[PDB]
Design a protein around this nucleic acid. Structure first.
Ligand code: FES
Ligand code: K
Ligand code: K
Ligand code: K
Ligand code: K
Ligand code: MG
Ligand code: ZN
Lengths: 77, 193, 168, 54, 295, 119, 53
RNA sequence: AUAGGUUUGGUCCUAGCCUUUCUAUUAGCUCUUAGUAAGAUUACACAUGCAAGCAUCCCCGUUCCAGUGAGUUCACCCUCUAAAUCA
């Protein structure tokens, strides 16, 4: 792809991009769907983050992990 | 030529002619490839018959037109498998051309699939440690409230006609760049009569 | 033939037969042994036969050997906490010395099994990719799925060359 | 409600662990405060155009 | 109250284990496979008996009987019906959960149909997908043609019943319809043509006995055992029949007459056994021969 | 290759041969090439119907959740695949595209009917 | 392992950062607009069609 | 390597060279079809066209992808801790 330094093409100097025509009924319905959809996904994401964080903590300082560490120390002694 | 055994290929191997030509040795016992050097080329010739013309030193299969490589000619196929290990000899071993080695390999596999050729079938372990079918994955999941009532899983799947005030806002914002308003979609997918 | 006495010691098979995998605490192992005397034969045999096996299984543990510094042979292990484990090995055979250190400082067979199972999970059977990492390279290898175009040509209707010809 | 599949997987864990309950798993969306797309952003963290003049 | 023994009960397992037998030469028959130079050890008689004992232990693991399971019930559960998606896609999507550390029977495999219904995969689809992603050695995604009636009858003509059984165990799951069908059709052919020795000293004998006892056709097996001087096994077979059919004429007959040993065969032969006449003649011949050797 | 910024994304890496597409679901750095370095393979997607008339999708759901919980974004085609599986809600654009198709096909039935009726 | 110093790479870096602070364009220059062509003369970029009104 | 040819009038030993095998480029001569894969010798010089936009202005992106192999132990592990994603 082009770099910032590369010059712009002569053909594209006069090109103007026109936005698509908007359908009112479809536009509003779609906007709400995105709001609801993204709210549901954000809740799911939050739940997945909590699970990951909990698993890491459990491995680091979980009761079973600490118990194993103490058992290993006792066996060594 | 036209061999009379194409329909019943197994008959040739029990005929008198076969016993006079081959006896009890495999059909390839006497074949020797002609090549330069002491180490032979690691592939055999592609085909012994080109455009219905046979080459100078035809391979064991192509030199006799009555030997038909068929999944039913089990006695012929057995000659090309190791009795002690069950592996199909690679083509340089017997000297069959690549074309006939491919046909032999396919026929040997077809005979083994049909049960005509015996091969070692091992005793395998069970796939699963537990055979319980009580987990929800395989059992019936309690139906969700929306599924029982016939509603969409999430309410925003269904089309809800927007209020008129909101439609006016969009018609003000996109002045001069508006499409025909669309009503509620058809309740089910139509079909071309 | 292979050079040296007991050439078996210089084979990967022999070097992998060591059963002493030190716990992560062990950092240094100093082997003090005497070259002569009947009471030190086991230590001499332990240095001759078993140090190669121990080092092969514990590449990051420093093993240093000292000859004829003390009247009797002994082992000393320096742990990461700073504890020093002195193991007197006089009168013991090389087999006894090896079993003694496995008990006090060697990982048990359960600990080793677990580590090997964790390695199993690194390779997933379902994953597709190069043969170095995965069993199969493409889904086309799975029977029933559309074969590779290189082996079985695709129908003209499924090929882009003629998809756009039928349309235009 | 949880989506179809996730719901079925949470109910199966309950039964596998032994907990017998008929309550429906549901996502708490009260924490998620969905703001409008045209809400003023933080100008402090916004960048600036560079010096290259035409 | 009074539960009838299951196939995996310790009592049934002991009976069926002994009935099977242990021929070390058959269990460890030389396999036609890629070979390696054999190794040799200089062993004393004591050491030779210890190695033979270890072979008996290993052989008993190889003969461990597969558990007999009841036919799995078809899965027909709909997770959701998104009718909006109807008509959008022409082909169904099969989604397989490939999370490594999950028992294969606890995996969620669902199908999105073109109508929009998200349904759990059928037992057949479930097994096909597990092979696609967790391929098992000896299992094929597409059912091998060997299992067709015509192809299975050639295998029987060659006395390759054990081979048919090993193929079935590798391809099909123990509770699948195809699995149960094939084993049932193999067991029937053994009975019709009296080939019970083919499955002796194999892990498939117990299943064959279980099929015969629960379908009340233990006549052929009893005759063979007597003809082969296996009374202990024949008596145990009749005993087991009584335990699985306690409210039966033979069971009551043995109870009424307190029959034991050979008597159990006579009581069963007359009352319930279909071939009562043939059994008596066969049992008669044996008892006469046994009396001679005793002299 | 240390990129400037970027983020992890779960996306479809195109494999296969000409006219035989095959996708591998991979968690890769946003800036990495489509078919280049990836962090972890999370499934596969055969878009061609097989002999049984199935489009096969594998989803390592345990690891997909782990990566979404570590801040991995999602491509639109990947979000739509999880919607069809039922792991996420149906993406709004599949609903709208389904409705657009319904309207198109409903309009097609008028012209067809008129032709048969009028002529 | 001793990396050879690159002094010109650091000199130019400091000079650039400095010039970016002394020759920085003002909001008058950056956010100017020609109300006939509707283009920012600083960069010569057209505004989006939806903002023209 | 399962080896082979070659020192001499001849033998044995040692030894180099070469042969037979498998790939990749180029040359000569020759060449029907289909699918697929791969594809400047040169970090030498380059005509022409195109390869980065998006968007209610601000920002963001053009630091990516793509290319090359000139230079060359900057790539791996550990420790520590920026920027970045998780609104
Ligand atoms: S390697 Fe699978 S399509 Fe070619
Ligand atoms: K030589
Ligand atoms: K050429
Ligand atoms: K923008
Ligand atoms: K280079
Ligand atoms: Mg930070
Ligand atoms: Zn030939």
């Amino acid at each position: 792809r082009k770099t910032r330094h590369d010059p712009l093409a002569k053909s594209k100097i006069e090109r103007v991009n026109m936005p698509p025509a908007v359908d009112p009924a479809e536009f509003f319905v779609l906007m709400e769907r995105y709001q609801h959809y993204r709210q549901t996904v954000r809740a799911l994401r939050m739940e997945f983050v909590s699970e990951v964080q909990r698993k890491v903590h459990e491995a680091r300082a979980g009761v079973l992990a600490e118990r194993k560490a103490l058992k290993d120390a006792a066996e060594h002694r | 030529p036209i061999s009379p055994y194409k329909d019943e290929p197994w008959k040739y191997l029990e005929s008198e002619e076969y016993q006079e030509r081959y006896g009890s040795r495999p059909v390839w016992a006497d074949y020797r490839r002609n090549h330069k050097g002491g180490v032979p080329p690691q592939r055999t010739r592609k085909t012994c018959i080109r455009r219905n013309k046979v080459v100078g030193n035809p391979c064991p299969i192509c030199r006799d037109h009555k030997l038909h490589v068929d999944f039913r000619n089990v006695k012929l196929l057995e000659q090309f498998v190791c009795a002690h290990t069950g592996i199909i000899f690679y083509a340089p071993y017997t000297g069959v051309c690549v074309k006939q080695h491919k046909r032999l390999t396919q026929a040997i596999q077809k005979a083994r699939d049909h049960g005509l050729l015996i091969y070692h079938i091992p005793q395998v372990e069970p796939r699963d440690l537990d055979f319980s079918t009580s987990h929800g994955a395989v059992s019936a999941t309690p139906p969700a409230p929306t599924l029982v009532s016939g509603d969409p899983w999430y309410p925003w799947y269904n089309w809800k006609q927007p209020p008129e005030r909101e439609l006016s806002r969009l018609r003000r914002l996109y002045q001069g760049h508006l499409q025909e308003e669309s009503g509620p979609p058809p309740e089910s997918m139509p079909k071309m009569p | 033939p292979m050079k040296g006495r007991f050439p078996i010691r210089r084979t990967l098979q022999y070097l992998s037969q060591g059963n002493v995998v030190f716990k992560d605490s062990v950092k240094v192992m100093t082997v003090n042994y005497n070259t002569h005397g009947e009471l030190g034969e086991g230590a001499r045999k332990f240095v001759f036969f078993n140090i190669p096996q121990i080092q092969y299984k514990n590449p990051w543990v420093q093993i240093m050997m000292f000859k004829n510094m003390t009247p009797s042979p002994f082992l000393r292990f320096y742990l990461d906490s700073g504890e020093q484990v002195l193991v007197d090995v006089e009168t013991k055979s090389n087999k006894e010395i090896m079993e003694h250190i496995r008990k006090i400082l060697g990982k048990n067979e359960e600990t080793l099994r677990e580590e090997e199972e964790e390695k199993k999970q690194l390779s997933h059977p379902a994953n597709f990719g190069p043969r170095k990492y995965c069993l199969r390279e493409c889904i086309c290898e799975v029977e029933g799925q559309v074969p590779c175009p290189s082996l079985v040509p695709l129908p003209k209707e499924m090929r882009g060359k003629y998809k756009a010809a039928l349309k235009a | 409600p949880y989506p179809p599949l996730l719901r079925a997987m949470i109910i199966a864990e309950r039964q596998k662990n032994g907990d017998t309950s008929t309550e429906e798993p549901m996502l708490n969306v009260q924490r998620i405060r969905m703001e409008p797309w045209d809400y003023p952003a933080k100008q402090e963290d916004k960048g600036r155009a560079k010096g290259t003049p035409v | 109250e009074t539960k009838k023994p299951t196939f995996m009960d310790e009592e049934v397992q002991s009976i069926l284990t002994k009935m099977t037998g242990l021929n070390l030469q058959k269990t460890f028959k030389p396999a036609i496979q890629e070979l390696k130079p054999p190794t040799y050890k200089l062993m004393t008689q004591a050491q030779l008996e210890e190695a033979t004992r270890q072979a008996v232990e290993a052989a008993k693991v190889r003969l461990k009987m597969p558990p007999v399971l009841e036919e799995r019930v078809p899965i027909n559960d709909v997770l959701a019906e998104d009718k909006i998606l109807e008509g959008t896609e022409t082909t169904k999507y099969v989604f397989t959960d490939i999370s490594y550390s999950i028992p294969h029977r606890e995996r969620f495999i669902v199908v999105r149909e073109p109508s929009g219904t998200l349904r759990k995969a059928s037992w057949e689809e479930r097994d096909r997908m597990i092979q696609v992603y967790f391929p098992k050695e000896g299992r094929k995604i597409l059912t091998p043609i060997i299992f067709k009636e015509e192809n299975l009858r050639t295998m029987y003509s060659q006395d390759r019943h054990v081979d048919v059984l090993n193929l079935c165990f590798a391809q099909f799951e123990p509770d699948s319809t195809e699995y149960i069908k094939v084993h049932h059709k193999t067991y029937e052919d053994i009975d019709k043509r009296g080939k019970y020795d083919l499955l002796r000293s194999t892990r498939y004998f117990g299943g064959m006995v279980w099929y015969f006892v629960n379908n009340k056709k233990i006549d052929g097996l009893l005759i063979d055992q007597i003809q082969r001087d296996l009374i202990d096994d024949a008596t145990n077979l009749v005993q087991l029949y009584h335990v699985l059919h306690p409210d039966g004429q033979s069971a009551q007959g043995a109870k009424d007459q307190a029959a034991e040993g050979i008597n159990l065969i006579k009581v069963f032969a007359k009352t319930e056994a279909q071939k009562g006449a043939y059994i008596e003649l066969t049992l008669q011949t044996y008892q006469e021969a046994l009396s001679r050797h005793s002299a | 290759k240390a990129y400037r910024g970027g983020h992890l994304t779960i996306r479809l890496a195109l494999g296969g041969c000409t006219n035989r597409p095959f996708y591998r679901i991979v968690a890769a750095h946003n800036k990495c090439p489509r078919d280049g370095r990836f962090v972890e393979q999370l499934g596969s997607y055969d878009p061609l119907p097989n002999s049984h008339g199935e489009k096969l999708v594998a989803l390592n759901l345990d690891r997909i959740r782990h990566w979404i919980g570590c801040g991995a974004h999602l491509s639109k085609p990947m979000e739509k695949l999880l919607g069809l599986a039922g792991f996420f809600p149906l993406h709004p654009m599949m609903i709208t595209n389904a409705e657009r198709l319904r309207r198109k096909r409903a309009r097609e039935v008028l012209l067809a009917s008129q032709k048969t009726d009028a002529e | 392992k001793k990396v050879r110093p690159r002094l010109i790479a650091e000199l130019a870096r400091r000079v650039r950062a400095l010039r970016e602070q002394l020759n920085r364009p003002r909001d008058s220059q950056l956010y100017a607009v020609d109300y006939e062509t509707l283009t920012r003369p600083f960069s010569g970029r057209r505004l989006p069609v939806r903002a023209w009104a």
